[PDB]
Amino acid sequence: SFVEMVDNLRGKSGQGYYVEMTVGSPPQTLNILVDTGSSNFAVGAAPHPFLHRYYQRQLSSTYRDLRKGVYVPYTQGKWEGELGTDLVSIPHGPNVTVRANIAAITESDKFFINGSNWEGILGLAYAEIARPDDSLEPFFDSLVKQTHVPNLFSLQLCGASVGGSMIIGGIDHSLYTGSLWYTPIRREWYYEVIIVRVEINGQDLKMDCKEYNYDKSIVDSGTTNLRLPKKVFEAAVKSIKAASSTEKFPDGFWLGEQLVCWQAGTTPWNIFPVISLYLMGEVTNQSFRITILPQQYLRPVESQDDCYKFAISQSSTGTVMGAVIMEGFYVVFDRARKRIGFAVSACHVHDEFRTAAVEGPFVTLDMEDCGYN
């Protein structure tokens, strides 16, 4: 049942959302980070200063060695591991056990976060970008193949310790208000979408829409910030900087290096603009926009003063729709129908005068005009 899967995600702000999983026989409990931005299921398999527990292949009778080395470089951080198969379960997910590929992390650089409470990564994206090759079946692919669990999952990430829901095998209707708006998955590698228009405070950025997706645009639960290509970032910052001319900022603030503070509860939310990302619909006249408040891109950081970090950074590998974007919304990864749905989450940040929204329809440009090749 879907009720059993509600509130099954936990985490710490800016340290990722994780799900409880068991590996091996007898089952070993491990918290695993939910990452829609990669395709490898990997778990710490050796002692680490940041790990409280790890996967022990010697203690599992159902463990099978694949005798193959694997290495995955992320945008930030990387790990090395030995490949193998074992029985995997999700206690607060569907009541099933599956044989899946597991990368036993032996060494890593800047991957694990100190006190994050997670011990591994669940790559929910497609085989095309799995390491070392697309022949290594990702976990969700293994789950669908072995069971009757529908080829669909949905993420409801809630902001300010953080909680959330990963509904495996369908959609939970109590976790969203209004309508679900779907955007096509352009290619089955990352969860690649197409951004067709960007509006800041109702003003069009007036950029070639191919720039918004320069290289690509991806939906990534394993990235905190909203990330934009160099050119788009430059224009976006120029808009937010000009909208908030009343307050003075340090130079490092816009680069995610410095924090800005105000008096307790005297945060000037009003002068910070809303950002509208328009996502191409399955039909071009059925496109829609997701609007995010300053409360989403100005992340709270730990003095009675309220301090905030600018949670928009530039990218070299295209747009990344991180937690910042996802946190206000119920995001449905409809793999079966090659599309991603957006709806207003039940756990949204409540602004007095403004509201985060998924609104449509809109007429926009299509894949020919906005897609990069």
CA dihedral of 76, 41, 172, 226, whole degrees rounded to 10: 10
Q: Does 77 bind ligand FRP (CB under 6 A)?
A: yes
**Is 334 a residue of the active site?**
no
Q: Which of 1, 58, 61, 76 binds ligand FRP (CB under 6 A)?
A: 76
x/- mask, ligand FRP, residues 110-129, rule CB under 6 A, reads: -x-x-------x-------x
Nearer to ligand FRP, 142 or 313 (CB): 313
Q: Which range touches ligand FRP (CB under 6 A), out of 12-20, 52-60, 100-108, 340-348?
A: 12-20
3-state helix, strand, coil in the chain (%, to 5): 15, 40, 45
The terminus-to-terminus CA distance of the chain in angstroms comes to: 41
**Distance of closest approach, residue 114 Cβ to ligand FRP, in angstroms:** 11
Q: Which range touches ligand FRP (CB under 6 A), out of 67-75, 275-283, 294-302, 352-360?
A: 67-75
Within 37-56, which residues bind ligand FRP (CB under 6 A)?
37-39
* 220, 251, 351, 369: the active-site residue: 220
Q: Does 108 bind ligand FRP (CB under 6 A)?
A: no
Q: Does 334 bind ligand FRP (CB under 6 A)?
A: no
The pair of three-digit structure tokens given for residue 224, joined into one six-digit string: 């905190």
Within 189-228, which residues bind ligand FRP (CB under 6 A)?
220, 222-224
For 371, phi then psi, to 5°, come to -85, 140
Q: Say if CB 112 and CB 48 are below 8 A apart.
A: yes
Query: What single letter denotes the amino acid at residue 13?
Result: S
The pair of three-digit structure tokens given for residue 216, joined into one six-digit string: 């690509």
What is the torsional sign of CA 236, 238, 241, 244?
A: negative
Tokens 């790559």 sit on residue? 123
**Distance of closest approach, residue 113 Cβ to ligand FRP, in angstroms:** 6
Nearer to ligand FRP, 76 or 303 (CB): 76
Q: Say if CB 40 and CB 123 are below 8 A apart.
A: yes
Within 126-145, which residues bind ligand FRP (CB under 6 A)?
129, 131
Cα–chain-centroid distance for residue 32?
Answer: 14
**Distance of closest approach, residue 257 Cβ to ligand FRP, in angstroms:** 13
Q: Say if CB 201 and CB 293 are below 8 A apart.
A: no
Q: Which range touches ligand FRP (CB under 6 A), out of 66-74, 139-147, 197-205, 292-300?
A: 66-74
Nearer to ligand FRP, 220 or 334 (CB): 220
Nearer to ligand FRP, 72 or 365 (CB): 72
Q: Which of 16, 81, 120, 273 binds ligand FRP (CB under 6 A)?
A: 16
| HEC string for 5-61 | HCCCEEECCCCCEEEEEEECCCCEEEEEEEECCCCCEEEECCCCCCCCCCCCHHHCC
* Interacting residues toward ligand FRP by CB under 6 A: 14-16, 33, 35, 37-39, 72-77, 111, 113, 121, 129, 131, 220, 222-224
The catalytic site residues sit at 220
